[PDB]
Amino acid sequence: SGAIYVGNYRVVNRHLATHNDWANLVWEDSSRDLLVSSTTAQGCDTIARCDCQTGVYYCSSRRKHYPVSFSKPSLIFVEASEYYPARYQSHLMLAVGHSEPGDCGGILRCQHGVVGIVSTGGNGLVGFADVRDLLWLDE
Numbered sequence: 083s084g085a086i087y088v089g090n091y092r093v094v095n096r097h098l099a100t101h102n103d104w105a106n107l108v109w110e111d112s113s114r115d116l117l118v119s120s121t122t123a124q125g126c127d128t129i130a131r132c133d134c135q136t137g138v139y140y141c142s143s144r145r146k147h148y149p150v151s152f153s154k155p156s157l158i159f160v161e162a163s164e165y166y167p168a169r170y171q172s173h174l175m176l177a178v179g180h181s182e183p184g185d186c187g188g189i190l191r192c193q194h195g196v197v198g199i200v201s202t203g204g205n206g207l208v209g210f211a212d213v214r215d216l217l218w219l220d221e
């Protein structure tokens with residue numbers, strides 16, 4: 083689990099969004115596994131606006147923050163899971179690292195801010211849903 087709080091927005095994995103998130107929906111994309119909802123309180127996270135490919139992510143299944151190198155956001159085939167059938171997920175970045183389903187929501191950050199959140203994994207890989215292209219999160 084996990085979320086990003088920026089301005090009056092809350093960014094979560096679409097598959098983990100609550101009834102309140104869907105009731106206060108701003109934008110969602112199943113192909114990205116992202117959902118953004120509005121909030122009443124101001125958040126304190128800063129979204130990175132950059133092309134970094136190194137950062138640190140939180141892995142709840144290890145209670146550890148791992149430094150990683152990650153690929154640029156791309157369209158990647160993602161196997162079937164409890165929440166989606168087998169499909170291509172867009173804006174996904176991969177890294178060699180540990181991840182389990184419950185690790186979704188873990189933040190990936192670089193020197194500039196939040197880059198994205200854990201969204202996929204398995205086989206010694208971890209995939210992160212990019213949020214740096216969502217410029218409207220800043221205003």
Ligand SMILES: Cc1cccc(CN2C[C@@H](C(N)=O)CCC2=O)c1
Binds near residue numbers: 115165200203
């Ligand atoms: C983080 C992770 C590790 C291993 C396996 C998974 C599988 N998975 C894929 C997610 C998606 N974005 O398609 C939806 C929910 C889910 O359980 C995730």
Ligand SMILES: [Zn+2]
Binds near residue numbers: 133195
């Ligand atoms: Zn950066």
